[PDB]
Design a protein around this ligand. Structure first.
Ligand SMILES: Nc1ncnc2ccc(-c3cccc(Cl)c3)cc12
Ligand code: NA
Length: 275
């Protein structure tokens, strides 16, 4: 009924990813040595968010919520969740020769992202921040989503869907569940090319171009017809005709993965070789 102090339960080890998620630490469950990710927030409601993040995180493609703690003093709120030890998808692409993942790896990771999103969407939750950095890997090559729900900063715009960017005909910016599907397509281009489209643009210029530009496309013609079609589905310009999570899960690029077993093996081995 009342949040406990974390002393002797969880301890902070080091900042993750040294300065990319803000106040998120690699932590450890004191009594068992089990690792955990801990978001540290300064606080002056909480209990409801605890019970809410609890139920929707029980899915295999979402990092599991453990509990909430209050470090007394401004008081610190500690949000404890399952740690994913093999870094982010962005790290994976960065640590790969040529900053590009094989198409079957992209198909596997994209399906796991979509499965996580399908669980949140069915429960009327919008992730709002799908990107390579928020999709984490475990040592067993399990794919898990992270960072779903002060608010004074605007983050990176490269994964933002057109409807989420306010402009003359769209004065009130629309975060719709389909906005996460646009971000999944940008994440798939990020896996294929090493960076999102418009990465060569200043962030404010990219924010102006996203609602105006036609849908982004893969630079190379080497990819399969299925992959181009998957990107096209994610990146439907007008969210009103954009397919739902359930429709994208049935797209042949996602649905038809004959080398699935070997992909998980390749990913597990690649994690070891590039650690
Ligand atoms: N669960 C995690 N495992 C490993 N690294 C991580 C890095 C960052 C995060 C993370 C990032 C933003 C917001 C929240 Cl609540 C958690 C979670 C993890
Ligand atoms: Na989970």
């Amino acid at each position: 009924s009342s949040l406990r102090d974390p002393a002797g339960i969880f301890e902070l080890v080091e900042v993750v990813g040294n300065g990319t998620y803000g106040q998120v630490y690699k932590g450890r469950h004191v009594k068992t040595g089990q690792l955990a990710a801990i978001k540290v927030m300064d606080v002056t409601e909480i209990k409801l968010e605890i019970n809410m993040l609890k139920k929707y995180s029980h899915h295999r493609n979402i990092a599991t919520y453990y509990g909430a703690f209050i470090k007394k003093s401004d008081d610190q709120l500690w949000l404890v969740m399952e740690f994913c030890g093999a870094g982010s998808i962005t790290d994976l692409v960065k640590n790969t020769k040529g900053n590009t993942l094989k198409e079957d790896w992209i198909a596997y990771i994209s399906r796991e992202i979509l499965r996580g999103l399908a669980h949140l969407h069915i429960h009327h939750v919008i992730h709002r921040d799908i990107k390579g950095q928020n999709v984490l890997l475990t040592e067993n090559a399990e794919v898990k989503l992270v960072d779903f729900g002060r608010n004074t900063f605007i983050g990176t715009p490269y994964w933002m869907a057109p409807e989420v960017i306010a402009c003359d005909e769209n004065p009130d910016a629309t975060y719709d569940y389909r906005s996460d599907l646009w971000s999944c397509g940008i994440t798939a281009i990020e896996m294929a090319e090493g960076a999102p489209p418009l990465c060569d643009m200043h962030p404010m210029r990219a924010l102006f171009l996203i609602p105006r530009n036609p849908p982004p496309r893969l630079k190379s013609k080497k990819w399969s017809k299925k992959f181009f079609s998957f990107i096209e589905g994610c990146l439907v310009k007008n969210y009103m005709q954009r397919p739902s999570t359930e429709q994208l899960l049935k797209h042949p690029f996602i649905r038809d993965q004959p080398n699935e077993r070997q992909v998980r093996i390749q990913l597990k081995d690649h994690i070891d070789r590039t650690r």
